[PDB]
């Protein structure tokens, strides 16, 4: 069978991108991670301290504890057929702010920006998102765009 090593199979996930080796850019160190914010988990082989396990590389959770160099994350991990809330300690070099909820917070502020206009104008502009509706009826002009006759080309070996 396989080995139960903590880094078995992490040859490529913990490696660094091509021509992106060396020291970690310091902007990643000066990012503030408060409690309850959504962060991604992407382990780096450069910082061998506070590494997340390979099962959390690519997962996303929220921060519950903040320390000097690391952050406590609550991550979901499916073991066999149950999903468990894992509290893992990961240094800030292996995490980053998740832009998943940023699209939601952008829409929340934009929803509150457009409904206060209704209280000042008297409209009911719908705020709900809608799937891609069927294409409406349109006229396709052929003034300077004549339909070109296409034909299957003969076979060439």
């Amino acid at each position: 069978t396989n080995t139960r090593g903590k880094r078995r199979g992490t040859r490529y996930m913990f490696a660094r991108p091509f021509r992106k080796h060396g020291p970690i850019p310091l902007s990643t160190y000066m990012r503030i991670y408060k409690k309850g914010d959504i962060v991604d988990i992407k382990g780096t082989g450069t910082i061998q301290k506070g590494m997340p396990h390979k099962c959390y590389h690519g997962k996303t959770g929220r921060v519950y504890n903040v320390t000097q160099h690391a952050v406590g994350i609550i991550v979901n991990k499916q073991v066999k057929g149950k999903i468990l809330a894992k509290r893992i300690n990961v240094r800030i070099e292996h995490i980053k702010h998740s832009k998943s909820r940023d699209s939601f917070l952008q829409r929340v502020k934009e929803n509150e920006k457009k409904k206060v206009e209704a209280k000042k104008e008297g409209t009911w502009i719908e705020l709900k998102r809608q799937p891609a509706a069927p294409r409406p009826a349109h006229f396709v002009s052929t003034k300077n765009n004549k339909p070109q006759l296409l034909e299957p080309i003969p076979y060439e070996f």
Partner: protein, 49 residues
Amino acid sequence: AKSKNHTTHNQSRKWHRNGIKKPRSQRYESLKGVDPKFLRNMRFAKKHN
């Protein structure tokens, strides 16, 4: 007398039989594992307000 070693064949059908329930993130999540210095001052900020 050899047998079958390992299988995960029927497991997915057993997992979704009772459903794969996500962990219920209850309101006011617990404070176990937080920084003891942070919890010490937080318990001082609660006994004085």
